[PDB]
Amino acid sequence: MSNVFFDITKNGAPLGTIKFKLFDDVVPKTAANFRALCTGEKGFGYAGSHFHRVIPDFMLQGGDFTAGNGTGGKSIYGAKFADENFQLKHNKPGLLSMANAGPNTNGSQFFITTVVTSWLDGKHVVFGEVIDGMNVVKAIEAEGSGSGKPRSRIEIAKCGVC
Numbered sequence: 440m441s442n443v444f445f446d447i448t449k450n451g452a453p454l455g456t457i458k459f460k461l462f463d464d465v466v467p468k469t470a471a472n473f474r475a476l477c478t479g480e481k482g483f484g485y486a487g488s489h490f491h492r493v494i495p496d497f498m499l500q501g502g503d504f505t506a507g508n509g510t511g512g513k514s515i516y517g518a519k520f521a522d523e524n525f526q527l528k529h530n531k532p533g534l535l536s537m538a539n540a541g542p543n544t545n546g547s548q549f550f551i552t553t554v555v556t557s558w559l560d561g562k563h564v565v566f567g568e569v570i571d572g573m574n575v576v577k578a579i580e581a582e583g584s585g586s587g588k589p590r591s592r593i594e595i596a597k598c599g600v601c
C-alpha cells in the first residue's frame with residue numbers, strides 16, 4: 440500500500456518527479472494494477488513509456504507501454520478488467536484516473552487531470568492523486584497541444600514504489 444512515483448524526462452532531460460497516493464481503501468484492484476505497473480514486477484510496466492496524449496487545460500494521458508499511441512497497454516490481470524467502482528469523483532486537478540475504450544475496458548492507460556473534469560464521473564475510475572510534483576505535471580501539460588499531440592517526448596524514465 441505504498442505511494443508511487445514517476446521520474447520524468449523531456450527529450451531525455453530530467454524534468455522532475457511526480458509522487459502519488461493510491462486509493463486502495465476504495466479501489467484496491469485498480470490501485471494494485473497501477474502500483475504493479477510502476478514497480479514493473481510482472482515483467483512489464485510504465486518504465487520507459489511516454490505520455491502520448493497531452494491536452495492543456497484538461498489532462499495528461501499515458502500508460503501505453505505496448506504500442507505507445509493510445510491503442511495498447513495491458514493490466515496485470517489480463518488485457519482488460521472491469522470498472523471497479525465510480526465512488527471517487529474527478530473533483531480537482533491532480534487526480535489519477537483510468538483511460539478506457541468504454542465500460543469495463545481498463546488496461547494500463549491512465550490520465551492525470553489538470554482541472555476539474557466532472558463530466559468524466561461515472562465513465563472513468565479515479566484511483567489516486569498527486570501528492571508532490573504538481574509543478575512537473577504543469578510542465579508536462581505545457582508540452583501538449585489542442586489535438587493532444589505532444590511537442591516533445593515526455594517519458595517515465597523511472598518509476599516504482601516509495
Ligand code: PRO
Pocket residue numbers: 492498500537538539550563
Ligand atoms: O483521451 C480522452 O480524451 C478521454 C478523456 C480522458 C480519458 N479519455
